[PDB]
Design a protein around this ligand. Structure first.
Ligand SMILES: [Cl-]
Ligand SMILES: [Zn+2]
Ligand SMILES: [Zn+2]
Ligand SMILES: [Zn+2]
Length: 117
DNA sequence: TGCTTCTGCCAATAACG
DNA sequence: CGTTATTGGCAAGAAGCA
């Protein structure tokens, strides 16, 4: 009982018992619920900040290494995260990387070990 | 106002038996 | 060891700062 279910128009939703946020996926509810329970801790390996989600920790750790995984394909400049990449492409090249063309490249993470695609 | 950090989807990984 | 369960990387918009 970390949740209850709402069903509307046949659509099933999962509701956090603590903050009442709704989720389409039970996986999302559980991932989210750690924020309340802190059953799992995700400590930074370079400082000792601790995160409630594994992905928050990983994004943070990349800031420590300084790796620049995001590369603008228009001019070659590289950026540490999606937001800097996107902002660059929008302001400098007047294009939207969420459009129908691929304007950037996401290099593999090499400054540390995360699972790979 | 401009950085900065904060859930659906499903591939990669793990757990199971 | 291969079948099922779980993890968490990713996008990109939202929210949270100051
Ligand atoms: Cl780099
Ligand atoms: Zn909650
Ligand atoms: Zn850290
Ligand atoms: Zn560029």
């Amino acid at each position: 009982d970390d949740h209850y279910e709402l069903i509307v128009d046949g659509r099933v939703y999962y509701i956090c018992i603590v903050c009442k946020r709704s989720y389409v996926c039970l996986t999302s509810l559980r991932r989210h619920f750690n924020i309340h329970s802190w059953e799992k801790k995700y400590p930074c390996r370079y400082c000792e900040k601790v995160f409630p989600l594994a992905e928050y920790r990983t994004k943070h750790e990349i800031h420590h290494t300084g790796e620049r995984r995001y590369q603008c394909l228009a001019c070659g400049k590289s950026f540490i995260n999606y937001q800097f990449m996107s902002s660059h492409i929008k302001s400098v090249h007047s294009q939207d990387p969420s459009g129908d063309s691929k304007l950037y490249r996401l290099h593999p993470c090499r400054s540390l070990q995360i699972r790979q695609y």
